[PDB]
C-alpha cells in the first residue's frame, strides 16, 4: 500500500496488445507459413502456442499483477536468490532499445520520402543505382532490384561500409528520425501509464485500421489468390519435420512478450482482483489473429507481384526488414494511388514498433522505480537520461555501417539471452516458489485456481519447450554473416558478452547476496528460497 493504477482496463489491454503486436507479426509469421507449407504450419504453431507459449504469457501477467512490482523487486520478493533474473531481464530490454527503435526510424524515413508522386524506389534510373539494378526482385545476388538499391544505397548507404569495423559517417536525416522516435516515446512514457495508457489507444488500434485497408486493397488485385495459396496451402509433410516444430516454437515464444519484464511491469499496475486469466487468453488470441490477418495482407500483394509483375514467388517471399522496406513498397509503387498505400503502410510500421518499444522502456523504468525510490520520485529526468543514452549509442546505428551494428544486436542481444532467463523464470516459479503456492496466489486474485493443465505446462512442458528451442538454436548455430559479408571473430565475441551480460546476472546475484547473509547453507540457502512472507 499503495501503488498507481491503470486508467481502466482498455488502457492495459491496448498496452499489452500494443506491445505484443509488432513487425514480427507481419514480416515473420506469414513467411514461416509459406516456408513450412501453409496452414499445416498452424498445427505445430497452435500446439507450441497452447502448451509452451500462452502458459508463459499467462504466468508473467499473473505474478506481475499479483506482486504488483517491477521485475527486479518482483523476483526479489519471490525468490531472492534468483533476483538476478530481474536484473538480467531488465538489461536485456535495455539492449533491445539500442537497436529495435531504429526500425521505427527507418519507417519514419520512408514515411518522409513517400510524400511525393513517382516514388523514388520504383526506378533504376536514379543516381544511386548500379548497372546491375533490376525493376524487381531476382535470384542472383550481384543483381539487385530498384526498391532494394534505394534502401541499401540511399537510405542505409550500406555500400559505403566494408564491415562493422567501419561505420562510416553519421547520417543526420536518419539521426533526425531516431530523435523523432525517442521524442514520441518520451512524451508517451513521460507521466507513466496515465499518458501511456491513452497513447496506446492509437498505436495499438491504428495498425488494425491500415491492415483492414491493405487487406482489402490487396485482395482487390490480380493474382491475389495465388499469393494466398503460397501462404496457406497445406503441406502436412512439414509436420514431421523437426525444424518446423522449432520455428513454430520459436516464433510463438518471441511473438508473445514473456521474460522481458514488460508484461510483468504492465500487469503490476492492475487491480489485485482484476481477472488476468481472461486478459491473458484474450491478448494472446488477438496477437496470433493479427499475424494471421497480416499474412493475407502480405501474400495478397506478394502473389500480385508474381502474377502481374512477372517475378518468382521464391524471390519476393521473404522475412525481416527486407520484406517491409523493399519487397512490399516495390509492389505499392506499381499500384494506382501509390502515394496513399505507401504513407499508411510506413505509418503502420512505425505504430507497430512504438507500443512495442513503450513496453520495453516501461519494463526498465517500472522495474527500477520499484527498486530505487530515487528515480521513482524523479521520473521525467530519468527517462530523459535513459533515452539520451539510447540516442547517443543509437547514433552508431544511424551511421553508414549502421545495419551491420543493427544486425549484430538483433542476433546476439535478446536472442540467446532471454531463453535461459525465461527458463529460470519458469523453474523458479514452478519449483523454487512452487506451483501449488503460485496457483493459490491466482485463486485469491481472480477467485479460482488455474486448471491442472496450466500447472503441468508451467512445471514440465515450458522448461522442456524452452530448452528445446535453446538446444536446437545452439546446434544449428553459425557464425554471424550478412549477405556476402562475414563478421570477424571478434565481432562474434563482442555479441556473446552482450548475450552473457544479462544471463550472467542470474548466477552472479545468486552468489553475491548468498555471501551477504549469515549462517550456513542450507540455512543461507533457505533464506533465499523463501518468498516475502513479512
Amino acid at each position, epitope marked *: 500500500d499503495e501503488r498507481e493504477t491503470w486508467s481502466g482496463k482498455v488502457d492495459f489491454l491496448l498496452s499489452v496488445i500494443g506491445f505484443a503486436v509488432d513487425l514480427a507479426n507481419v514480416w515473420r509469421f506469414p513467411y514461416l507459413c509459406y516456408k513450412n507449407g501453409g496452414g499445416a504450419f498452424l498445427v505445430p504453431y497452435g500446439i507450441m502456442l497452447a502448451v509452451g507459449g500462452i502458459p508463459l504469457f499467462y504466468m508473467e501477467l499473473a505474478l506481475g499483477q499479483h506482486n504488483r512490482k517491477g521485475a527486479i523487486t518482483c523476483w526479489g520478493r519471490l525468490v531472492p536468490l534468483f533476483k538476478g533474473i530481474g536484473y538480467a531481464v531488465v538489461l536485456i530490454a535495455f539492449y533491445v532499445d539500442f537497436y529495435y527503435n531504429v526500425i521505427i526510424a527507418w519507417s519514419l524515413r520512408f514515411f518522409f520520402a513517400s510524400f511525393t508522386n513517382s516514388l523514388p524506389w520504383t526506378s533504376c534510373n536514379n543516381i544511386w543505382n548500379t548497372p546491375n539494378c533490376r525493376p524487381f526482385e531476382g535470384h542472383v545476388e550481384g543483381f539487385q532490384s530498384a526498391a532494394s538499391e534505394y534502401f541499401n544505397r540511399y537510405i542505409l548507404e550500406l555500400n559505403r561500409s566494408e564491415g562493422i569495423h567501419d561505420l562510416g559517417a553519421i547520417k543526420w536525416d536518419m539521426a533526425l528520425c531516431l530523435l523523432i522516435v525517442y521524442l514520441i516515446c518520451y512524451f508517451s512514457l513521460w507521466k507513466g501509464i496515465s499518458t501511456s495508457g491513452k497513447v496506446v489507444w492509437f498505436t495499438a488500434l491504428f495498425p488494425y485500421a491500415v491492415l483492414l485497408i491493405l487487406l482489402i486493397r490487396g485482395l482487390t488485385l490480380p493474382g491475389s489468390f495465388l499469393g494466398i495459396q503460397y501462404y496457406l496451402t497445406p503441406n502436412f509433410s512439414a509436420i514431421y519435420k523437426a525444424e518446423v516444430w522449432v520455428d513454430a516454437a520459436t516464433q510463438v515464444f518471441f511473438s508473445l512478450g514473456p521474460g522481458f519484464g514488460v508484461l510483468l511491469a504492465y500487469a503490476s499496475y492492475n487491480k489485485y482482483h482484476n481477472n488476468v486469466y481472461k486478459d491473458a487468453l484474450l491478448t494472446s488470441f488477438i496477437n496470433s489473429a493479427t499475424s494471421f490477418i497480416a499474412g493475407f495482407v502480405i501474400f495478397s500483394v506478394l502473389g500480385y507481384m508474381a502474377h502481374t509483375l512477372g517475378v518468382r514467388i521464391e524471390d519476393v517471399a521473404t522475412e525481416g526488414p527486407g520484406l517491409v522496406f523493399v519487397v512490399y513498397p516495390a509492389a505499392i509503387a506499381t499500384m494506382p494511388a501509390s502515394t496513399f498505400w505507401a504513407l499508411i503502410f510506413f505509418m503502420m510500421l512505425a505504430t507497430l514498433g512504438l507500443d512495442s518499444s513503450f513496453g520495453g522502456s516501461e519494463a526498465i523504468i517500472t522495474a527500477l522505480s520499484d527498486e530505487f525510490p530515487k528515480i521513482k520520485r524523479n521520473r521525467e529526468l530519468f527517462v530523459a537520461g535513459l533515452f539520451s543514452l539510447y540516442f547517443v549509442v543509437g547514433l552508431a546505428s544511424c551511421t553508414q555501417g549502421g545495419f551491420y551494428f543493427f544486425h549484430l544486436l538483433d542476433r546476439y542481444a535478446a536472442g540467446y539471452s532471454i531463453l535461459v532467463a525465461v527458463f529460470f523464470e519458469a523453474i523458479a516459479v514452478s519449483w523454487i516458489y512452487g506451483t501449488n503456492r503460485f496457483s*493459490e496466489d491466482i485463486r485469491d486474485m481472480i477467485g479460482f485456481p488455474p486448471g491442472r493443465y496450466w500447472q503441468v505446462c508451467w512445471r514440465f512442458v515450458a522448461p522442456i519447450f524452452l530448452l528445446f528451442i535453446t538446444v536446437y538454436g545452439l546446434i544449428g548455430y553459425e557464425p554471424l554473416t550478412y549477405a556476402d559479408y562475414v563478421y570477424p571473430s571478434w565481432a562474434n565475441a563482442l555479441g556473446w558478452c552482450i548475450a552473457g551480460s544479462s544471463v550472467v546476472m542470474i548466477p552472479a546475484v545468486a552468489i553475491f547476496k548468498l555471501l551477504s547473509t549469515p549462517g550456513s547453507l542450507r540455512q543461507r540457502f533457505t533464506i533465499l528460497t523463501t518468498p516475502w512472507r513479512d
Partner: antibody
Amino acid sequence: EVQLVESGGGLVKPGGSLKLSCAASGFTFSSYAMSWVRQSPEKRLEWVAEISSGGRYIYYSDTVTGRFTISRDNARNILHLEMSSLRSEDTAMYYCARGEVRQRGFDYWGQGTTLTVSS
Amino acid sequence: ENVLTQSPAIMSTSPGEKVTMTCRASSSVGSSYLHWYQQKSGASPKLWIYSTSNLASGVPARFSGSGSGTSYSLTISSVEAEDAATYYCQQFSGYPLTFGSGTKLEMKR
C-alpha cells in the same frame, strides 16, 4: 466420497475460549480452501472466516475479527478455529465447508458442531 | 458489508405449482459470484445453484436461477414435497461473505 466432520464445542462461559476442529477426508485437503460458517439459533447463516489452500490468505468477518483465529493442518487434513473472549452473540452451530472456487461457492458442508456461550 | 435480503420470509405452496423467491443486495454483485443453498430441517446446508444459473449435481431440472446486479431470483417450475426447505442466497463477490435472510418453503395442504 467427500466428508467433513466438525468436532469440539459445547458450553462455554462468556469471555472464555475454545478450539473447534474439522476433519477432512475424501479429497486432497491442501488443494481446496476452507471456511467457517455459523448458524445462530435464529437460523441466520453468517460467514465467519476463510483460510487459503496453503493457509496464507486469511479473511475474517468484522464480528469475530481479532477474537478468532483460523488455522490449517495440511499434514493430517484438519481445519481449526481458535476462539477467545467468546461472547453470547457467538452462540451457534459452526460448519466446515469448501470453499475453493469463488464462482462455485461452497462444495461440501460438514454436519456441524454446536457452541453455546452462557453463564 | 453487503446485505442480502430475501423475500418472502416464509412461503406456502401446493405441490406442482410454480414458486419464485427473490434476493436483493445492498451493493451490486457479480452474476458468477451469487449462489443458492438449500437447507432441509435438521440438516446441513447444501450447494444448490451457483453462478446465478448453473445447478449442482443431484439437483433436479425443476430448479432454475436468474437475475443480476442487485436483484436475483430462484424459481421452481413444479414444486414437490421434497423441495420443502429453507433456501439461502449468498455472494462471494467480496469480503466479508454474506448470506441472504433465507426463504422458508412450506407445502400447502
